[PDB]
Amino acid sequence: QRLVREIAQDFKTDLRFQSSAIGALQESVEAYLVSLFEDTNLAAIHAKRVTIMPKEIQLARRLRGE
DNA sequence: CCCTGGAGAATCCCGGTGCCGAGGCCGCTCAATTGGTCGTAGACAGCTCTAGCACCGCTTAAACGCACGTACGCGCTGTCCCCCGCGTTTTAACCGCCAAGGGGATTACTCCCTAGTC
C-alpha cells in the first residue's frame, strides 16, 4: 500500500486511496507474477537447470508480447 | 605455432532501354450546411452520509546476520552422427497444335404496320 501510494503521488498528488478495491488489484498483480514464474520455470526446465537467470525473464517478457 | 598473395566469387552501383499505371482531366452527383422546432439530458447547487487519516499501545510474525555445507551452472575434456553443398534426376505448370459447336452480332428476305387518292 505504501508503494502504490508512492507511485500514485507523482501521477496525481494528494490521491486519496480508497481502502476497498485494493485487494482485487493485489490479487491480480500476484496472479500475473505467478504466471511469469511458471513461464520462467518452464523455460528453466527447458534449459535443464533449476535456477533463474535474467535471460529467461526477459524472453518471457518479450514472447508474451510486452 | 598462425598470416597472407593470390584467386574465386558475392556486392554496390549507376547507365539504359521498355512498360503500364498514377495522376491529371472530364462529366455527373448526392450528401453536409442551414432555416426552424421541442423536448432531453446534463451542468449547477444542495442535503446528506460514509468511508478513511492519523493517532494511541501491543504481539510476537517476519527479517536479517552468521555459519555450515554442498552440489550445480558452467566450463574443461572427448567422440559421433547427421545435415549441408553440390551433382543428377524427375514432377509441374504454360504455351502452342487441331477440329467442332455456341452464340452473339449482323445483315438479307419479307411481311405486315402505315397511309394516299379517282
Residue A14 CA from chain centroid, whole number: 25
- Rounded, the Å distance between the CA of A21 and C1' of B22 is 58
Q: Report d(CA A15, CA A47) in Å as an integer.
A: 45
For residue A34, give the C-alpha cell: 505467478
Q: Is the CB of A18 under 7 A from strand B?
A: yes
Task: Name the nucleotide with the smallest C1'–CA separation from A55.
Answer: B73
* Residue with the three cell numbers 535443464: A48
Q: Report d(CA A60, CA A33) in Å as an integer.
A: 11
Q: Report d(CA A9, CA A22) in Å as an integer.
A: 16
CB A39 within 8 A of CB A55: no
Q: At what angle do helices A22-46 and A54-64 cross, to 10 degrees?
A: 110
Method: cryo-EM
CA distances from A63 to A13, A27, A52, A57 (A): 35, 24, 17, 10
Which residues does A64 contact at the CB level (< 8 Å), separation at least 6? A39
Q: What are phi and psi of A8, to 5 degrees?
A: -90, -20
